[PDB]
Structure formats: structure tokens, C-alpha cells
Design a protein around this ligand. Structure first.
Ligand code: A1BVZ
Ligand code: CL
Ligand code: NA
Lengths: 301, 305
């Protein structure tokens, strides 16, 4: 038992991290087979920050303007193309540490591990969720651009995030590994701000199910609710709407605990009204929204 | 900017994990050079665990009584011995993935990363503190025994923990890699409980410094205090006494922010007395005590491995 914010083992991603340099700009790249993926803004200079013309800046580069370093080895760039906001450097060596991998674009509420890297070297690993406003609450200093987010369900590494920038409110924005941003953001230093954030309702319920599995029942009540009445109350606390999809997804946790999803929704309504009265759930004094139903079942008995 | 609970990158340790089976018991081993380390209680049946005689049980065993698997490869066991509560299994082959490593014993209050494993397969990594009562608040299921805890200093892995058991309260107990328990526990199926725990004062202060550095500042104030004064408050609230050593360890963060430790203790004093006035610090409603001063400086300066 016990319940912890738990990341995937990072070894399969550590073997893929490299340094990419262009002009005076150094950031992280991701080395899979014979390709290195990195944010295209590596090719920008001081004035290219506001309104860069990427197609114009790239056409002015040759393969030999890109310095790629895997530890001590200098990889040789033989090819370069752009896909959306991601630059792809072909190299003469395929990475011998390349794992089974795939690229997936996740939805708001999904969780992944982040391997924070500086100068192509890993610094640490932690768990994040894609917020409903398409940002992540990360830990990223200058030089962390090119750091990736991933899941490792069953020895295959699914890459879902590459880090591009920090927005003025201290939250983080990036792309899938095909270079398409999550949310309405662009790789320009023009004024940008995230939408108002909301609490991931389905994840809060999954964590309440986790608390019950780990033998906590103090927050339950004899009440139930309609899905509609639940959504009318929840949205008054900036909670995401709960859909029939979300209800279906909680089915197995419902079955294991014998508490119906709409009975647990009644428990959540009460917690939102009363708070915790000096108690904690699974070690938190807040309702936690960065554990998915899949996360809860993976970690729990 | 931003501040998260962050583990060390685990790859150097994933390359050392193997599966050890003896009879019906499977659990995890650590394979370093030509030795596999695991808990001695692998050699016990359920009946044995009630009142085990490890000396006597172990001599009755032989090398071929121990199945050691590194992925889809059997290792050949050529020797077996016991050091305290750890079994050492000498094998015919050195781990070609052995990193630069030391065995280290940590102090209460210090943090480390756990690589949770099952059947010799790394499953997850998370950051823990050795509690003042010598338990860790882990996440472990059946089969997790032999999972290890570690730090990284430059390119050297310092192994500090091997998982042995869950206590009735949901918290976890284990040894260093020389087989000495952390806390007053024994490897036997018997009634054991965690001492009442306390809050790691110097870690809470480090976390308030991380809050300030990330622009969380409401809890600050014009006041200051003394060790004596604060410590009488600490004692009252089940906090560790704050030593002059703790105040010296926080020097960097007191500098880099222009808050003095007793300045910051005055903020913490008010928080324990008054509460958080329904606010949060770094997205917590609790005073968080599993970040060391080193953890805060490492994360707010970008130290790499
Ligand atoms: C890269 C990143 O997230 C970051 C972190 C801290 C300060 C600035 C940035 C930036 O957007 O360059
Ligand atoms: Cl998804
Ligand atoms: Na003060």
C-alpha cells in the first residue's frame, strides 16, 4: 500500500538525450534511429524572437551549422527538415540505445513523466498532467527546451510532449513529437497567456477511489446525485464537466470498491462544500487532480 | 521556474536490477560487479517468517537453490553468504552495466529516489525522505521486496536503501546495502509499529525558500526570532528542534532571497500558530517536509548527471 506521485523509469529516455547547438543557442534534442528531434526555435537569433520566418531562417542553414553532441561523440548532420514546430536533423549514426517507441498526442487530463535535461544531460524526472488549458505545471530553468514527456506502458516508450517555452504566469507550453502545439500557443515571443485553468474532475474521483482502496472512508456520505446536478455544482468551483465517458472510465474502480460513480460524485460535492476540517487524503490537504484512473489502477492493489 | 517533487534519473540503477527466486519466494536483487544483493528473508517459507533461524536455514541451502534472472538470462550462482539482513549471491559474471557506485547510510531528514520493481522489472521511480521515526512513506505492493533507494553525486550512484517490509500503518521499513535496518525493526512476521513521527523542520524551511524563489511570498513578515524561542514552538507542534547546523545549511537560500533563517522561522512560527489562512504554498495546503536544502538548490539551479 501507500500512494505516491510516481514517474516511469527514465533509463530508456536517458539513452536518447543529446545537445543541439545552432549559432549561440544550445538546447536538448531527442535521438531515435538516425534522427534528432528538437524545437525549431534553436535556429532563431536576438531579433528573430517576435516574428521569426522559420522557412526563411532554415533555408539559410547547411547541415554543418548544426553541432550535435551525444556525450563526447560529435554526431554528423547529413540532412535537415522542419515538421510544424519541430526541426528533424538526420545523422549518419542510428542510436544503438533506441528503444521500442511511438509518438502519441494526448488529451487534457492525461499524465506523463518529464525527464528534465540541461546541455543534453538528465537532471531529474517527475510526473505532470496536461491541464484543461493545454499547459503543464513543470519545473524548467533556462536551457531545458527540448526536454520530453513520455509514458512507458509495457516496454514501449510513447513520446507525447517536447518542451518549448514558459508563459508569463510560470506554466509551460510545448508540442507533440510531430511539432503541433498543445493549445493556442506559437513559438514566437509575442504576448501570450493561458486560458483560466480548471480542476480535472475525473482524476479527483479516481484519487478518492485510491483513498478508499487504501482504507480511508471518512469522506463518503449516504447520498447520490444525478450527473447533471453534479456538473451544475462542480462548475461553480472551476471543475471540468464530468461526461458519460468519464463515468464509464471509472467503472472498474467503482466495481473494486462497491461505491457507484454517482455516489462518489456526491462525496466530492460535500468535500467542495466543507473542505477537509484538518484531515488529509492520501497525504494531501487538497483534492489532487494529476492521477488518472489508469494511474490509480497501475499503482493500487 | 516551477517546483516539483523530482527523482534522480534512474537509468544507471535500472541496469542493475535482477529477479531472485528461492523456493516459492520471488523478489528483486541488485547486481553489482559479480555479486547480487537481496533481503535474506528470500530463503524463508511463511512458517519460517514467524520465528526464523537465518544461520540454520541458510547453511541447509546451496548455490543451485537460488534462481537469478537478468531479463531472459540465468546467472550462475557460485557462492552465497549473509551480511546482517542482506543475502550476497556471488555469480560467475560481472555486471557489464555496473556504474561507479558506493554503499552509503543516510540520516533521518535526508531524501533519496526509490526505483520500485516487480519480478526484477523496474516499474516506477519516486522521491522519499527517511522519516525521523526511520520509516519511509512509500508506494509498494507484494513482490516489491529488494527495490532500492539511491542518490547521484556527479556520475557516482550512492545506494542507501533496500526495501524489506510494510508496517501495519501503511509505511515501509528496510536496510542499508550492508543489511542494517533503519529503525527498531526486525525481518520477522511479528507485531511492529512506527514510533510517533515528527516534522523535519529544516526541510519545511527549505520548502518555504523554494516558495519565495517561485514568487509565493504572502506568509513572509517583518518579524524575526531566536532558536530558543522557535524551538519551544517547534517542540509544541511535534517539530524537530532546529540546530545551528540547520541554520548554516540554509545559508545559501537565506542569501539568494534576503530572508534570514530566524526571519523565515518567524514566518513558520506564525503558520503553525495561526494556520495558512486558507491559502496555499507551491500548490500545497500542508507544510511540506520531504525537500532538503540541497533538493531546493539543485532544482532551482539545474544540476545535471
Ligand atoms: C525553457 C523554459 O521553460 C524557461 C524556464 C525558465 C525561464 C525561461 C524559460 C524560457 O521560456 O526560455
Ligand atoms: Cl490521452
Ligand atoms: Na520575517
Amino acid at each position: 500500500s501507500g500512494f505516491r506521485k510516481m514517474a516511469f523509469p527514465s533509463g530508456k529516455v536517458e539513452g536518447c538525450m543529446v545537445q543541439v547547438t545552432c549559432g549561440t543557442t544550445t538546447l536538448n534534442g531527442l535521438w531515435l534511429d538516425d534522427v534528432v528531434y528538437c524545437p525549431r526555435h534553436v535556429i532563431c537569433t536576438s531579433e528573430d524572437m517576435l516574428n521569426p520566418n522559420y522557412e526563411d531562417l532554415l533555408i539559410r542553414k547547411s547541415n554543418h551549422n548544426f553541432l550535435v553532441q551525444a556525450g563526447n561523440v560529435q554526431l554528423r548532420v547529413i540532412g535537415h527538415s522542419m515538421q510544424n514546430c519541430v526541426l528533424k536533423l538526420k545523422v549518419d549514426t542510428a542510436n544503438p540505445k533506441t528503444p521500442k517507441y511511438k509518438f502519441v498526442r494526448i488529451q487534457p487530463g492525461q499524465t506523463f513523466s518529464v525527464l528534465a535535461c540541461y546541455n543534453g544531460s538528465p537532471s531529474g524526472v517527475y510526473q505532470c498532467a496536461m491541464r484543461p488549458n493545454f499547459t503543464i505545471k513543470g519545473s524548467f530553468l533556462n536551457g531545458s527546451c527540448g526536454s520530453v514527456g513520455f509514458n512507458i506502458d509495457y516496454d514501449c516508450v510513447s513520446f507525447c510532449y517536447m518542451h518549448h517555452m514558459e508563459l508569463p504566469t510560470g506554466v509551460h507550453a510545448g508540442t507533440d513529437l510531430e511539432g503541433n502545439f498543445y493549445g493556442p500557443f506559437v513559438d514566437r515571443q509575442t504576448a501570450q497567456a493561458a486560458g483560466t485553468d480548471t480542476t480535472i474532475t475525473v482524476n479527483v474521483l479516481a484519487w478518492l477511489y485510491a483513498a478508499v482502496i487504501n482504507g480511508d472512508r471518512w469522506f463518503l456520505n449516504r447520498f447520490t446525485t444525478t450527473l447533471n446536478d453534479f456538473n451544475l455544482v462542480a462548475m461553480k468551483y472551476n471543475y471540468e464537466p464530468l461526461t458519460q465517458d468519464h463515468v464509464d472510465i471509472l467503472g472498474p474502480l467503482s466495481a473494486q470498491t462497491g461505491i457507484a460513480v454517482l455516489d462518489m460524485c456526491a462525496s466530492l460535492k460535500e468535500l467542495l462544500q466543507n473542505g477537509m476540517n484538518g484531515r488529509t487524503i492520501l497525504g494531501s490537504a487538497l483534492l489532487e487532480d494529476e492521477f488518472t484512473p489508469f494511474d490509480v489502477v497501475r499503482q493500487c492493489s
